[PDB]
Amino acid sequence: PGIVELPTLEDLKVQEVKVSSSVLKAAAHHYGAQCDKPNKEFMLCRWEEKDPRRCLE
């Protein structure tokens, strides 16, 4: 019943953060201190929409 709408591949293209887990863990504290506003905006979108398709931007 119904058709599931999925984003196109071009809508899922972005520059990837291709550092390993060790680099990320080393940077984690400062990264959370500095990049907090976009991260919290994304998390609020994620927990309010309950849909990965509505928080791609």
Binding site: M43, R46, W47, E49, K50, D51, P52
Partner: protein, 69 residues
């Protein structure tokens, strides 16, 4: 004998009418109750035959460590 031991026919007449009215009302009430019971059991929209359902107050409306619940 009639004066000492018995009464007039009007008393028995009107008592019979009262008894008949009571019994007819009871019969109609019994039939109506049976019909109402049948309808309530068939539909479930009345106060009777209300089988329990899960209380919605038990649901936890909190973030669930995962955005998609």
């Amino acid at each position: 004998i009639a004066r000492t031991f018995y009464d007039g026919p009007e008393k028995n007449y009107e008592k019979t009418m009262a008894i008949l009215q009571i019994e007819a009302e009871k019969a109609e009430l019994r039939l109506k109750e049976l019909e109402v019971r049948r309808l309530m059991r068939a539909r479930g929209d009345g106060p009777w035959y209300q089988y329990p359902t899960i209380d919605k107050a038990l649901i936890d409306h909190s973030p669930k460590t995962t955005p998609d619940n």
